Amino acid sequence: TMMSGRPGRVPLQFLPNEARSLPPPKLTDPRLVYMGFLGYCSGLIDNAIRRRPVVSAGLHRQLLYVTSFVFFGYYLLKRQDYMYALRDHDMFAYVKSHPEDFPEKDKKTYGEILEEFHPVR
Amino acid sequence: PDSWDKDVYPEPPRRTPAPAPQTSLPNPVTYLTKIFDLLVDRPVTLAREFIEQQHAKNRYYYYHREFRRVPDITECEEKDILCMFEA
Numbered sequence A: 001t002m003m004s005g006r007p008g009r010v011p012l013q014f015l016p017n018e019a020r021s022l023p024p025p026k027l028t029d030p031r032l033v034y035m036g037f038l039g040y041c042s043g044l045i046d047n048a049i050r051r052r053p054v055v056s057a058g059l060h061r062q063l064l065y066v067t068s069f070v071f072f073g074y075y076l077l078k079r080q081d082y083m084y085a086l087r088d089h090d091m092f093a094y095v096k097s098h099p100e101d102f103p104e105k106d107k108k109t110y111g112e113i114l115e116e117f118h119p120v121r
Numbered sequence B: 001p002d003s004w005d006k007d008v009y010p011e012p013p014r015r016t017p018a019p020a021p022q023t024s025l026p027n028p029v030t031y032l033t034k035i036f037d038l039l040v041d042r043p044v045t046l047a048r049e050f051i052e053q054q055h056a057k058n059r060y061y062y063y064h065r066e067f068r069r070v071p072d073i074t075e076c077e078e079k080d081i082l083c084m085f086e087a
């Protein structure tokens, strides 16, 4: 386990207060659209299993499927973006704190670099 | 037409010997050349004249794209993707 045990981690918290400094996902996000598509597919499968007209029966429950999937997907995307931002922040902090472990290397141009040539014949 | 550079595409001067017949018989090649000029060359020349007159009514130009010089892979640093792409 990598992230668990991080200092300042409040248990059983889906979104801490520091996650509110990040841009919230746009409502037109392709991931949100895919979540809504999954909800619509679940509604169609529900109609098919229960032996109802697939594309015309249960419009209210299909709408509820889509809405629930979009809601949960939005919150899941917020948490995912927060976790990735936290990972990048920790990585950059450690790189700053350990310059001898992450040193800069000399940049030699290809004119100076010697590389072997392997003919194709 | 000669819309090309003679220096880039060299061609030695053309030496055509003059016709010096030694017989009284007529020349079928010459007669057929006259017939060909009367029947083919003149009509195609007239058609080309009409077409080129129509082309000169609206004359527009196109250009040869010039590409700037950029630093090459010798000057590019290692793992420098933009300079490597340009080179």
Ligand SMILES: CCCCCCCCCCCCCCCCCC(=O)OC[C@H](COP(=O)([O-])OCC(O)COP(=O)([O-])OC[C@@H](COC(=O)CCCCCCCCCCCCCCCCC)OC(=O)CCCCCCCCCCCCCCCCC)OC(=O)CCCCCCCCCCCCCCCCC
Residues within 6 Å of the ligand: A037, A040, A041, A044, A045, A048, A052, A053, A054, A055
């Ligand atoms: C935007 C594009 C999105 C594309 C999405 C593609 C993926 C969709 C996944 C989810 C699909 C859910 C389907 C539920 C079951 C439906 C079954 C059925 O009867 O359907 C007929 C049904 C109407 O007929 P019905 O009289 O009510 O039903 C007759 C009974 O079923 C009585 O008929 P029966 O019982 O006599 O039928 C016998 C049949 C009964 O068996 C079936 O019908 C089963 C078919 C498969 C269902 C389970 C699929 C699970 C997910 C597989 C994912 C694979 C990868 C997909 C990658 C997709 C990438 C895009 O069994 C057999 O024939 C036995 C042999 C089976 C061979 C293997 C079949 C399975 C292949 C597996 C892959 C299939 C993928 C495509 C499935 C498409 C289904 C519509 O029509 C539809 O369901 C049409 C749905 C699509 C159009 C909806 C209207 C849209 C209008 C606005 C368009 C706007 C466009 C832009 C905005 C878009 C916003 C979203």
Ligand SMILES: CCCCCCCCCCCCCCCCC[C@@H](O)O[C@H](CO[C@H](O)CCCCCCCCCCCCCCC)COP(=O)(O)OCC[N+](C)(C)C
Residues within 6 Å of the ligand: A004, A010, A011, A012, A013, A014, A076
């Ligand atoms: C298809 C398979 C995925 C199924 C998805 C549904 C599974 C159940 C989801 C239930 C979500 C409940 C969320 C309500 C708040 C719960 C808060 C708490 O319980 O969990 C928080 C968030 O933790 C949850 O586990 C995250 C929920 C993520 C739910 C979706 C997972 C998707 C996985 C990727 C599948 C692909 C996506 C498919 C679309 C969903 C904080 O956890 P924390 O105490 O602080 O961390 C230590 C605990 N450890 C040890 C387990 C790590």
